Amino acid sequence: EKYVVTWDMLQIHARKLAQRLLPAEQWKGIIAVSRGGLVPAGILARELGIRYVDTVCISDLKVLKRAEGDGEGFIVIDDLVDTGGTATAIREMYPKAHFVTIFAKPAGRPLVDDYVVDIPQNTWIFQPWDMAVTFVAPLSGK
Amino acid sequence: EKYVVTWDMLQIHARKLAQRLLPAEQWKGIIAVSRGGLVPAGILARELGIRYVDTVCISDLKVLKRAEGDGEGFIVIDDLVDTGGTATAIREMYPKAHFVTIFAKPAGRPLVDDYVVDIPQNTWIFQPWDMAVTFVAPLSGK
Amino acid sequence: NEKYVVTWDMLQIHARKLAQRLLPAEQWKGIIAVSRGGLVPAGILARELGIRYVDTVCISDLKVLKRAEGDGEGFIVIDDLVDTGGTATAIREMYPKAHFVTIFAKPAGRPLVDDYVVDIPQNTWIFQPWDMAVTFVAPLS
Amino acid sequence: NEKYVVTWDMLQIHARKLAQRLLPAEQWKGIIAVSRGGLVPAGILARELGIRYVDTVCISDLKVLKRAEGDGEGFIVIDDLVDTGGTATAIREMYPKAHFVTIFAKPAGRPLVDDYVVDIPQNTWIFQPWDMAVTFVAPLS
Numbered sequence: 001e002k003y004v005v006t007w008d009m010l011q012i013h014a015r016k017l018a019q020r021l022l023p024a025e026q027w028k029g030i031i032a033v034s035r036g037g038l039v040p041a042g043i044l045a046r047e048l049g050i051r052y053v054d055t056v057c058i059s060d061l062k063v064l065k066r067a068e069g070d071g072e073g074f075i076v077i078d079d080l081v082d083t084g085g086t087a088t089a090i091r092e093m094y095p096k097a098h099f100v101t102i103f104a105k106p107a108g109r110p111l112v113d114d115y116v117v118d119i120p121q122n123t124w125i126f127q128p129w130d131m132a133v134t135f136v137a138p139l140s141g142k
Numbered sequence: 143e144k145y146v147v148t149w150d151m152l153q154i155h156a157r158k159l160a161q162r163l164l165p166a167e168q169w170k171g172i173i174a175v176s177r178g179g180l181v182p183a184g185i186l187a188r189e190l191g192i193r194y195v196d197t198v199c200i201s202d203l204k205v206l207k208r209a210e211g212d213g214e215g216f217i218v219i220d221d222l223v224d225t226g227g228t229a230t231a232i233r234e235m236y237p238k239a240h241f242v243t244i245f246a247k248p249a250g251r252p253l254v255d256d257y258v259v260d261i262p263q264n265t266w267i268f269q270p271w272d273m274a275v276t277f278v279a280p281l282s283g284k
Numbered sequence: 285n286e287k288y289v290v291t292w293d294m295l296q297i298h299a300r301k302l303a304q305r306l307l308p309a310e311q312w313k314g315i316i317a318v319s320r321g322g323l324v325p326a327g328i329l330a331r332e333l334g335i336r337y338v339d340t341v342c343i344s345d346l347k348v349l350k351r352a353e354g355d356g357e358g359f360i361v362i363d364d365l366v367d368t369g370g371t372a373t374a375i376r377e378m379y380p381k382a383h384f385v386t387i388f389a390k391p392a393g394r395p396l397v398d399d400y401v402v403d404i405p406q407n408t409w410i411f412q413p414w415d416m417a418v419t420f421v422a423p424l425s
Numbered sequence: 426n427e428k429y430v431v432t433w434d435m436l437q438i439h440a441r442k443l444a445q446r447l448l449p450a451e452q453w454k455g456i457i458a459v460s461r462g463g464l465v466p467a468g469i470l471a472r473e474l475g476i477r478y479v480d481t482v483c484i485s486d487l488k489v490l491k492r493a494e495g496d497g498e499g500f501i502v503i504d505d506l507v508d509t510g511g512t513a514t515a516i517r518e519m520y521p522k523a524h525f526v527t528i529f530a531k532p533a534g535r536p537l538v539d540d541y542v543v544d545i546p547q548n549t550w551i552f553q554p555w556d557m558a559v560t561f562v563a564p565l566s
């Protein structure tokens with residue numbers, strides 16, 4: 001039911017993905033799927049040496065802001081593809097991009113080129129930006 | 143081929159397991175399978191309020207040191223069951239213990255009562271005590 | 285020559301202290317991340333403030349690879365570190381009406397930001413969380 | 426009243442500094458962990474020194490739940506923290522020939538150990554890595 005993503009695991013997954021995206025010279029840039037794609041974008045950008053980073057912001061679908069063009073030469077990175085509503089729109093608007101995510105649930109999974117971790121459709125994922133390291137009582141209260 | 147266990151993930155897995163082992167009053171103590179079982183033992187001991195913690199030390203099988211008795215009322219905890227050579231001996235020498243591990247590869251998996259994470263037989267597992275947080279060059283060298 | 289080593293958890297603690305000072309969220313049109321250093325702090329602020337409008341500026345007569353349009357009115361501009369003031373001056377030139385904020389500030393960058401969380405000595409040898417990872421190390425024996 | 430918060434990574438850094446001082450490994454029959462606090466540092470030392478003989482002592486006229494036999498000759502005895510000296514005095518009584526070591530020492534425990542890595546003020550409010558975990562926190566918005 002619950003899946004907890006720590007910062008160190010997200011980075012491990014993002015670095016695994018960056019290794020698959022070598023060589024860096026094949027890319028013009030990275031488009032982050034906001035807000036969830038910002039952290040994995042920053043990690044891929046650091047690993048690949050890519051300084052051209054842009055965003056697409058999707059909120060009944062509303063586009064708040066988008067990077068221009070059809071995605072040719074670009075990585076488009078998400079943290080999670082879930083229902084496939086956002087992934088459908090991204091795959092459609094950037095048809096020539098290499099569309100990657102860290103996490104894929106089944107409804108989103110076949111709409112990306114690549115993902116690192118499969119998660120069941122009904123699992124509640126907590127990303128690192130949703131959590132804090134806090135005191136936790138012994139589970140037994142003893 | 144490679145599976146990296148961070149300290150924070152090991153703890154998450156050990157706390158999940160401790161929750162399954164409630165209530166704490168059903169246990170006389172915990173036996174750690176040394177050396178790998180020491181860290182998960184300490185986490186279970188903290189979560190369960192259990193102060194009676196002992197070890198079994200197995201090294202062609204040699205027993206360097208073992209806790210006395212048949213395991214009745216005890217949790218026996220390992221970090222990993224791998225080939226099943228150690229898990230066979232532990233399951234045999236502590237037949238009444240509740241034998242748990244964090245990680246199970248298939249050859250060891252059916253010799254425990256409970257485990258948290260399945261790992262493929264041929265995956266090289268790095269436990270937190272095998273690693274350090276160090277500077278890492280950008281994968282691209284750019 | 286001690287390394288100042290930032291953990292993911294410490295970066296998030298500092299980003300949250302900053303996000304608290306930027307409340308209420310309603311006052312902002314969005315966040316502009318200074319690429320690449322500002323992307324992770326932008327993801328944190330955007331979660332904390334419930335802001336979905338996030339854009340970037342990618343700096344090289346000021347030359348840019350890419351920039352969010354406008355003079356920054358209504359925007360938070362976020363960097364991880366203002367160090368020499370080189371990037372800080374290009375942000376003030378491009379976005380004179382943004383609220384320009386940083387996690388870390390050295391004295392050369394400090395005068396050019398609206399807010400920072402942690403100031404460090406100019407000489408500080410700073411490693412951000414994305415510069416470090418767990419790697420195998422042989423036993424000491 | 427600041428919390429002194431130990432991370433897993435910092436505990437391991439300190440345990441490794443200690444393991445380096447205990448080389449060579451050949452000089453030890455084994456390690457006795459002071460339960461429960463010493464179990465995690467025992468797992469680290471045992472990996473670093475390549476020691477497979479690890480035993481425990483579980484303290485309550487000194488009363489124990491369980492103890493490794495003998496007077497400690499050839500053994501490292503490891504605790505996480507010597508605080509009041511209450512546990513430290515029971516270890517010296519039971520294992521007068523052990524090399525008694527700790528990660529952390531407060532002044533009341535300090536005189537009763539052979540080695541420590543980090544000394545902290547007697548009043549320090551210390552959280553070990555196993556007292557903390559990642560938990561959901563609502564956004565600031």
Ligand SMILES: [Cl-]
Binds near residue numbers: 080085087088108
């Ligand atoms: Cl989706």
Ligand SMILES: [Cl-]
Binds near residue numbers: 227230250
């Ligand atoms: Cl085994």
Ligand SMILES: [Cl-]
Binds near residue numbers: 051319320321
């Ligand atoms: Cl940069």
Ligand SMILES: [Cl-]
Binds near residue numbers: 365
């Ligand atoms: Cl700067």
Ligand SMILES: [Cl-]
Binds near residue numbers: 193
């Ligand atoms: Cl205790």
Ligand SMILES: [Cl-]
Binds near residue numbers: 506507508511513514
């Ligand atoms: Cl003590």
